[PDB]
Swiss-Prot record:
It comes from the Eukaryota. It is found in: Endomembrane system; Cytoplasm; Nucleus. The gene is JAK2. The chain holds residues 536 to 809 of 1132 of the full protein. Possesses 2 protein kinase domains. The second one probably contains the catalytic domain, while the presence of slight differences suggest a different role for protein kinase 1. This is Tyrosine-protein kinase JAK2. Residues 10-274 form the Protein kinase domain. The modification Phosphotyrosine is found at residue 35. It is linked to Chromosomal aberrations involving JAK2 are found in both chronic and acute forms of eosinophilic, lymphoblastic and myeloid leukemia. Translocation t(8;9)(p22;p24) with PCM1 links the protein kinase domain of JAK2 to the major portion of PCM1. Translocation t(9;12)(p24;p13) with ETV6. The lineage of its organism: Eukaryota, Metazoa, Chordata, Craniata, Vertebrata. Interacts with EPOR, LYN, SIRPA, SH2B1 and TEC. Interacts with IL23R. Interacts with SKB1. Interacts with STAM2. Interacts with IFNGR2 (via intracellular domain). Interacts with LEPR (Isoform B). Interacts with HSP90AB1; promotes functional activation in a heat shock-dependent manner. Interacts with STRA6. Interacts with RHEX; this interaction occurs in a erythropoietin (EPO)-dependent manner. Interacts with ASB2; the interaction targets JAK2 for Notch-induced proteasomal degradation. Interacts with MPL/TPOR. Non-receptor tyrosine kinase involved in various processes such as cell growth, development, differentiation or histone modifications. Mediates essential signaling events in both innate and adaptive immunity. In the cytoplasm, plays a pivotal role in signal transduction via its association with type I receptors such as growth hormone (GHR), prolactin (PRLR), leptin (LEPR), erythropoietin (EPOR), thrombopoietin receptor (MPL/TPOR); or type II receptors including IFN-alpha, IFN-beta, IFN-gamma and multiple interleukins. Autophosphorylated, leading to regulate its activity. Also phosphorylated by TEC. Phosphorylated on tyrosine residues in response to interferon gamma signaling. Phosphorylated on tyrosine residues in response to a signaling cascade that is activated by increased cellular retinol. Undergoes Notch-induced ubiquitination and subsequent proteasomal degradation which is mediated by ASB1 or ASB2, the substrate-recognition components of probable ECS E3 ubiquitin-protein ligase complexes. Ubiquitously expressed throughout most tissues. The record marks 175-176 as: Breakpoint for translocation to form PCM1-JAK2 fusion protein. Belongs to the protein kinase superfamily. Tyr protein kinase family. JAK subfamily.
Length: 274
């Protein structure tokens, strides 16, 4: 169970945008830290309306279950504020933010070896989740959080974490799932009860496309109905700008869920692109 954080100890300072039935802020948590030291810690706050009770329960159960698994590539959630009519996730503030925005701000002036390192780190996160049989369900480049930029002098790569899962596609409205094509795989559009570990392999492919397309969104020109039809017609994504990951994307975006390769196999493939 998440640590409870008092509303009194949270300051809200900036409105940052919106997720799926969430409102996002930057703020400050006043906390007693290690050694009893008082810290004012920058935090990312995700606010759910308690009136959307089913969405809130799904969101916080998903965040809590994944935060039980401490991992270098999984975002740190500090706890939850049951803040009256709203429930608030208090998450670490990642310095460089979402990867899709980062790639746009840097005009896709990143090389293929940087892309490979990010892809490997995500695959290692996904392998850990697979070993724990924990479905994420919302893998995408906006949910790749850049902790550190590369440092050419030390040779250190960029370093990422995967964000929390959000509301489950098993409870979201069908129209939201359709807007999330081609991250949500064809079997889950057909029936959201088809959610499975295989879901994340498909979404990982779509996320590799994003990484290799400088933060562009695939199928952005298609409305919900044309995206539903895109799956009816069994189409695949176009090859990305950086074509080096084209094969891996196609192998992951397999319309047969049982044919999508394991994360361990994906890691081996990424390693061999060298
Ligand atoms: C921020 C946001 C907007 C819509 S969704 C969402 C949350 N998340 C997907 C992105 C995120 N998560 C975490 N934990 N930290 C950050 N840092 C950050 C934020 C803004 C600028 C620079 C850095 N960004």
């Amino acid at each position: 169970v998440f640590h409870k954080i008092r509303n009194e100890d949270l300051i809200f300072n900036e409105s940052l945008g919106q997720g799926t039935f969430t409102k996002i802020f930057k703020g400050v948590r006043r906390e007693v830290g290690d050694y009893g030291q008082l810290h004012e810690t920058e935090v990312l706050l995700k606010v759910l309306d308690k009136a959307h009770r089913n969405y809130s329960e799904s969101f916080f159960e998903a965040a809590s279950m994944m935060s039980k698994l401490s991992h270098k590539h999984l975002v740190l959630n500090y706890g939850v504020c049951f803040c009256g009519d709203e429930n608030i996730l208090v998450q670490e503030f990642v310095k460089f933010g979402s990867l899709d925005t980062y790639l746009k701000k840097n005009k896709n002036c990143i090389n293929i070896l940087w892309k490979l390192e990010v892809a490997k780190q995500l695959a290692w996160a996904m392998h850990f989740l697979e070993e724990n049989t924990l479905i994420h369900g919302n893998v995408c480049a906006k949910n790749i959080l850049l902790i550190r930029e590369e440092d050419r002098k030390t040779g250190n790569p960029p370093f990422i974490k995967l964000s929390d899962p959000g509301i489950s596609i098993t409870v979201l409205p069908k129209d939201i799932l359709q807007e999330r094509i081609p991250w949500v795989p064809p079997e889950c559009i057909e029936n959201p009860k088809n959610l499975n570990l295989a879901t994340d392999k498909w979404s990982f492919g779509t996320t590799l496309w994003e990484i290799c397309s400088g933060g562009d969104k695939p199928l952005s020109a298609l409305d919900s109905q044309r995206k539903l039809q895109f799956y009816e017609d069994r189409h695949q994504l176009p090859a990305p700008k950086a074509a080096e990951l084209a094969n891996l994307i196609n192998n992951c975006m397999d319309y047969e869920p049982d044919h999508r390769p394991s994360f361990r196999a994906i890691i081996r493939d990424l390693n061999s692109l060298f």
